[PDB]
Design a protein around this nucleic acid. Structure first.
Ligand SMILES: [Mg+2]
Ligand SMILES: [Mg+2]
Ligand SMILES: [Mg+2]
Ligand SMILES: [Mg+2]
Ligand SMILES: [Mg+2]
Ligand SMILES: [Mg+2]
Ligand SMILES: [Mg+2]
Ligand SMILES: [Mg+2]
Ligand SMILES: [Mg+2]
Ligand SMILES: [Mg+2]
Ligand SMILES: [Mg+2]
Ligand SMILES: [Mg+2]
Ligand SMILES: [Mg+2]
Ligand SMILES: [Mg+2]
Ligand SMILES: [Mg+2]
Ligand SMILES: [Mg+2]
Ligand SMILES: [Mg+2]
Ligand SMILES: [Mg+2]
Ligand SMILES: [Mg+2]
Ligand SMILES: [Mg+2]
Ligand SMILES: [Mg+2]
Ligand SMILES: [Mg+2]
Ligand SMILES: [Mg+2]
Ligand SMILES: [Mg+2]
Ligand SMILES: [Mg+2]
Ligand SMILES: [Mg+2]
Ligand SMILES: [Mg+2]
Ligand SMILES: [Mg+2]
Ligand SMILES: [Mg+2]
Ligand SMILES: [Mg+2]
Ligand SMILES: [Mg+2]
Ligand SMILES: [Mg+2]
Ligand SMILES: [Mg+2]
Ligand SMILES: [Mg+2]
Ligand SMILES: [Mg+2]
Ligand SMILES: [Mg+2]
Ligand SMILES: [Mg+2]
Ligand SMILES: [Mg+2]
Ligand SMILES: [Mg+2]
Ligand SMILES: [Mn+2]
Ligand SMILES: [Mn+2]
Ligand SMILES: [Mn+2]
Ligand SMILES: [Mn+2]
Ligand SMILES: [Mn+2]
Ligand SMILES: [Mn+2]
Ligand SMILES: [Mn+2]
Ligand SMILES: [Mn+2]
Ligand SMILES: [Mn+2]
Ligand SMILES: [Mn+2]
Ligand SMILES: [Mn+2]
Ligand SMILES: [Mn+2]
Ligand SMILES: [Mn+2]
Ligand SMILES: [Mn+2]
Ligand SMILES: [Mn+2]
Ligand SMILES: [Mn+2]
Ligand SMILES: [Mn+2]
Ligand SMILES: [Mn+2]
Ligand SMILES: [Mn+2]
Ligand SMILES: [Mn+2]
Ligand SMILES: [Mn+2]
Ligand SMILES: [Mn+2]
Ligand SMILES: [Mn+2]
Ligand SMILES: [Mn+2]
Ligand SMILES: [Mn+2]
Ligand SMILES: [Mn+2]
Ligand SMILES: [Mn+2]
Ligand SMILES: [Mn+2]
Ligand SMILES: [Mn+2]
Ligand SMILES: [Mn+2]
Ligand SMILES: [Mn+2]
Ligand SMILES: [Mn+2]
Ligand SMILES: [Mn+2]
Ligand SMILES: [Mn+2]
Lengths: 112, 119, 44, 44
RNA sequence: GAUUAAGUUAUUAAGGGCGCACGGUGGAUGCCUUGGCACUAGAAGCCAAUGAAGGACGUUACUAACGACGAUAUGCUUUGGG
RNA sequence: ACCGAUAGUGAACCAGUACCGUGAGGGAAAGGUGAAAAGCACCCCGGAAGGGGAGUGAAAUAGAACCUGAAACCGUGUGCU
RNA sequence: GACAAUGGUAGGAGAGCGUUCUAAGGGCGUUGAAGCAUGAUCGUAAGGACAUGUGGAGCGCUUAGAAGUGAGAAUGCCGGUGUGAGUAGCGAAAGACGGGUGAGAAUCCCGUCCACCGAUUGACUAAGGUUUCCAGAGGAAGGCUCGUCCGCUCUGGGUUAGU
RNA sequence: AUGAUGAGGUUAAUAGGUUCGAGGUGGAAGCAUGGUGACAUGUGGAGCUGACGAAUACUAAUCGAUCGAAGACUUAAU
């Protein structure tokens, strides 16, 4: 049936990934592929790669009609956050969150 | 008239860009520098179309000092290229010796990108 | 501004090395305490 | 000047209702199967 | 004409709220024990110029680290066990 | 009729160690796949990371950042509004 | 069956709920323990069951014993994760283009031009550092962006004295 | 500031260029002459000229996409 793929632990902040994802969601596979290609945000190549892979194993593993698909759903979830810091004035240092995200994409068709 | 940096830097920058566009006869840059340069390069081409020694020295005033610009075997310096094949190429033309084509956004700075060539 | 601590192998060795430690009863007491604690590193 | 009380989940969300990249202007590309930005060049 | 007039009502959700469903992060909770903790009974209570305590440096086919061992180096002889 | 991983030694993990100080000195955090490594051949997207199949397994919705997996917190869908 | 009494701070008094361990008794449990999750369930309270899901071992009940027996506040200690907020910052400074490389280039290599220091941003060395030097690979992390690059990572290799 | 506002987007003067101008500068270069020369004079109100005025489609405003009506009920009056 309708297919899915995940990019786990990507080094982009979810707050950022979600921006493009919101463009992509519920769109037809071609539109979404385009919008991903032409959007100027950094997450775009990544989500491109993920919608692409999801489509690929949608075809090879379920013999799906690659034209008729839609982006059933797409979203990012909080991944583990690597924690850094930068030195500041008067010897104090301040926290920094290098956040990561579990991007997820699900292509679909006639549900039943 | 536009700005990237300081008036002297802006001058040198446009000089470099125009001289360069005359060498390699099309280039890639920001839409802004493209829109600024087209003025200068077109004015240099008109000096070249004029042909008089006055306008040759005027051309030399802005144009960058050197090229190999050799093509088939040695020769043409930029300036000489300008007053040479370049000028003769456009003598029958009205104005506008330059077009700007839009590449779309660059990667690292997300600058708009464009190609500027000369026909 | 120059900071405190301008390193000197010749001077750090003295007042802090095994010999200068052992030179007096108190350094003996020191190395005693550190070996007793179990330091991977005793003196300099 | 520092916040005097914390933003609620809900306040901060009403704040971000305008915070979103909008869909790019795009068009049917060169008859080459591509897809390109409006008024920007086809590419080979 | 839903035309005219007066009056009364609805749909909208950019976004938000409550309820629910499916996830993510996180590592509480349960279960567990390699380690501790306080005592019992009995041995034991010193080692060192015949160079100790503790080290440093070396030794494995490949060897960074701990342990073992030491230029006879990841061990030798010897007697008993197995 | 002591502790059960913030507990019990500082140290259940090669702790007086990362780290900190000129120095005496101070002094952590960090236990758990499974019965068995059987640790996912192979095909697919991808430079990889990662992932969908196909498989091992009672279980991987046990996949190594691995028992259980609470709350804060972050997200998708929506019934009423 | 009557009839009275039953606001309450410091405080006194009384009856009880629950947690851990022990003892004895009696039971449940891979036909699935604890824990966790949800529910519209029960008792006057603290609280107790029941069902379904998850989970994959251990648990209750009764009587009594003993306590590291109950948390929302100590600018309490530790851990996590929010708010602030896509906010501040990104550490003095001149770059532009062409040609390479590459999965990907404002940032790597090569080239041309331009620019900056020039009693120095050049040259040699003392302290101190102690492999950062070299070459070929690499890109998770470190680099305040990017990275094909690096004082970063892997592999191998480099310091030669009678004066 | 951004957005918003306005001028335009080929059947087009919206910006750039091109050609004239306005205003600004004050006499370009090359040459000729006069000087021993520094310099002076002529060619010649010369040359140069951001934003200001016009003319001209020579370059660029390409192809294209999205958004947007079918008009509730009651009562009175035609
Ligand atoms: Mg924060
Ligand atoms: Mg700037
Ligand atoms: Mg002009
Ligand atoms: Mg032309
Ligand atoms: Mg030494
Ligand atoms: Mg938000
Ligand atoms: Mg009306
Ligand atoms: Mg919305
Ligand atoms: Mg004894
Ligand atoms: Mg003796
Ligand atoms: Mg010894
Ligand atoms: Mg501990
Ligand atoms: Mg001190
Ligand atoms: Mg499977
Ligand atoms: Mg798996
Ligand atoms: Mg975890
Ligand atoms: Mg949760
Ligand atoms: Mg709704
Ligand atoms: Mg919502
Ligand atoms: Mg039961
Ligand atoms: Mg409950
Ligand atoms: Mg809930
Ligand atoms: Mg109980
Ligand atoms: Mg009980
Ligand atoms: Mg009791
Ligand atoms: Mg507190
Ligand atoms: Mg912003
Ligand atoms: Mg602010
Ligand atoms: Mg190269
Ligand atoms: Mg290379
Ligand atoms: Mg290439
Ligand atoms: Mg110097
Ligand atoms: Mg320097
Ligand atoms: Mg490479
Ligand atoms: Mg390299
Ligand atoms: Mg260096
Ligand atoms: Mg208007
Ligand atoms: Mg006309
Ligand atoms: Mg003369
Ligand atoms: Mn400091
Ligand atoms: Mn200057
Ligand atoms: Mn929102
Ligand atoms: Mn003796
Ligand atoms: Mn635990
Ligand atoms: Mn130190
Ligand atoms: Mn095990
Ligand atoms: Mn491949
Ligand atoms: Mn793989
Ligand atoms: Mn199986
Ligand atoms: Mn288990
Ligand atoms: Mn787990
Ligand atoms: Mn009372
Ligand atoms: Mn009363
Ligand atoms: Mn009392
Ligand atoms: Mn228990
Ligand atoms: Mn249950
Ligand atoms: Mn029971
Ligand atoms: Mn009891
Ligand atoms: Mn307590
Ligand atoms: Mn920004
Ligand atoms: Mn601001
Ligand atoms: Mn800023
Ligand atoms: Mn800087
Ligand atoms: Mn260079
Ligand atoms: Mn200079
Ligand atoms: Mn000077
Ligand atoms: Mn120097
Ligand atoms: Mn030295
Ligand atoms: Mn190097
Ligand atoms: Mn980086
Ligand atoms: Mn010699
Ligand atoms: Mn159109
Ligand atoms: Mn009515």
């Amino acid at each position: 049936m309708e297919a899915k793929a995940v990019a786990r632990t990507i080094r982009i902040a979810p707050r950022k990934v979600r921006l493009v994802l919101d463009l992509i969601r519920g769109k037809n596979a071609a539109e979404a592929i385009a919008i991903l290609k032409l959007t100027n945000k950094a997450s775009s190549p990544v989500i491109e790669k993920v919608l692409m892979s999801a489509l690929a194993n949608a075809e090879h593993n379920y013999d799906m009609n690659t034209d008729e698909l839609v982006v059933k759903e797409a979203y990012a979830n909080e991944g583990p956050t690597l924690k850094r810091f930068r030195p500041r004035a008067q010897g104090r240092a301040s926290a920094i969150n290098k956040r990561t995200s579990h991007i997820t994409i699900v292509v679909s068709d006639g549900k039943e | 008239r536009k700005l990237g940096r300081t008036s002297d830097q802006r001058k040198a920058m446009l000089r470099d860009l125009a001289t360069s566009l005359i060498i390699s006869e099309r280039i890639e840059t920001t839409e802004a520098r493209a829109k600024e340069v087209r003025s200068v390069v077109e004015k240099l081409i008109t000096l070249g179309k004029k042909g008089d020694l006055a306008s040759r020295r005027n051309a030399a005033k802005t144009l960058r000092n050197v090229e190999i610009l050799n093509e088939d075997e040695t020769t043409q310096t930029a300036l000489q290229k300008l007053f040479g094949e370049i000028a003769e190429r456009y003598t029958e033309r009205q104005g506008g010796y330059t077009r700007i084509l839009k590449q779309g956004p660059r990667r690292g700075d997300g600058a708009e990108s464009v190609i500027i060539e000369l026909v | 501004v120059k900071r405190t601590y301008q390193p000197n192998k010749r001077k750090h060795s003295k007042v802090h090395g095994f010999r200068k430690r052992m030179s007096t009863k108190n350094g003996r007491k020191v190395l005693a305490r550190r070996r007793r604690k179990g330091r991977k590193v005793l003196s300099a | 000047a520092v916040p005097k009380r914390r933003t609620s989940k809900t306040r901060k969300n009403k704040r971000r209702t305008h915070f979103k990249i909008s869909v790019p202007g795009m068009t049917e590309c060169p008859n080459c199967g591509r897809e390109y930005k409006l008024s920007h060049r086809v590419c080979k």
